[PDB]
Amino acid sequence: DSLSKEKLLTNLKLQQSLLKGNKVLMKVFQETVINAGLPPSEFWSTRIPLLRAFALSTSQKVGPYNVLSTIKPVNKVNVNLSREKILNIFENYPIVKKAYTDNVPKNFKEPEFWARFFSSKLFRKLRGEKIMQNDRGDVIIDRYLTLDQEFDRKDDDMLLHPVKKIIDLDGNIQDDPVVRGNRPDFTMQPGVDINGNSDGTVDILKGMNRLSEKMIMALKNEYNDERNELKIDDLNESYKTNYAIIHLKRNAHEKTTLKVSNQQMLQQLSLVMDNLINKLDLNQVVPNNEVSNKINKRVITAIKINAKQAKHNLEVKSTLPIDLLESCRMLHTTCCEFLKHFYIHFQSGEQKQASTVKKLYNHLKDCIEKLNELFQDVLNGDGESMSNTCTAYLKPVLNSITLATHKYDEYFNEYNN
């Protein structure tokens, strides 16, 4: 289908719609495609899963249902007319679609049109109700009765097919069809009057049945075996978890870039048992307030640096003006987008992408000059006092940018030279 990355890149109108839905994606799009000059093919090539998500969101439809059983008219009846319900009715009933397609633009307007549609006899007939001859309905829609009957016969013709043999009751009734005994009672014959004409409950059963087979064929759209279904697994072997076990072998290698004796540890054990059974002194443990003073010096030396870190243990409040702040933010964001595309370039490992790497490297050099002139402008417009803040804030991304430049230069000298 239209599910390949090529087709997702091809659906430019869908790209247009999702771009128009988003906002920061638009801003990124002008800055890259329109301002910097990024081709949209590799703009969206980094967004293929998001394009797929949008395509799935747009390209889905609901399951069918009976609009007529669900919807009740509730004296002009009030209607909560929904266009989704209207199209539900339309592709539920092509007879209704055909009655719509020649009435609204040619004969009469839309509100009078659906007023006649609610008024009509076919409304309550195709609805969950036997049609009454007392009802006046809509005489215009009464011309569609025999057309819908033709549709009924045609749909019956296309639905009718040879029946699976074991299921088929016609084989049972035709097993001995020459039996001449006695017919059953009035109970077993369908509900008819004294004139023999039926109530039509078999007819409405046929209609609701045919609704079920339209559901079956809606499932059965574009979008031997008897042995297995007659086989019984009740007295058979249960399914076995064939899952593989895992065993471990453990040998940790030691790190890559004096010994006391048993006599020594025995005699020190003897000495320490002697001291233990000898004496324990309470107040000998108090330090001399100079070695304790150096302990305090070391402790406060730790405390000063650690609490200075702990002084700085939505984002943080900034002294930048909002215009310069957002300009730095968006330049940082688009330069990150460049560098991610550069990792796409470099980790591709193809000679095919060489000119792409070259032209992008030119774009990154332009980004470097943009950053330098940006810092120069903030310097000369602010006296560097907050341009230092700007440069320090944008420092790590340009550091990784310089990392990318050095990698490109070194690998170019390695391969070319």
């Binding site: 430019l12 247009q16 771009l19 128009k20 638009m26 002008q30 495609v33 329109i34 949209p40």
Partner: peptide
């Protein structure tokens, strides 16, 4: 507002311009 529409329809004909060329 409307200012996004003239951007993305100019790009619509810009993509068609490279499509024919």
């Amino acid at each position: 507002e409307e200012r996004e529409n003239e951007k993305t329809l100019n790009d619509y004909y810009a993509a068609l311009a490279k499509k024919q060329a």
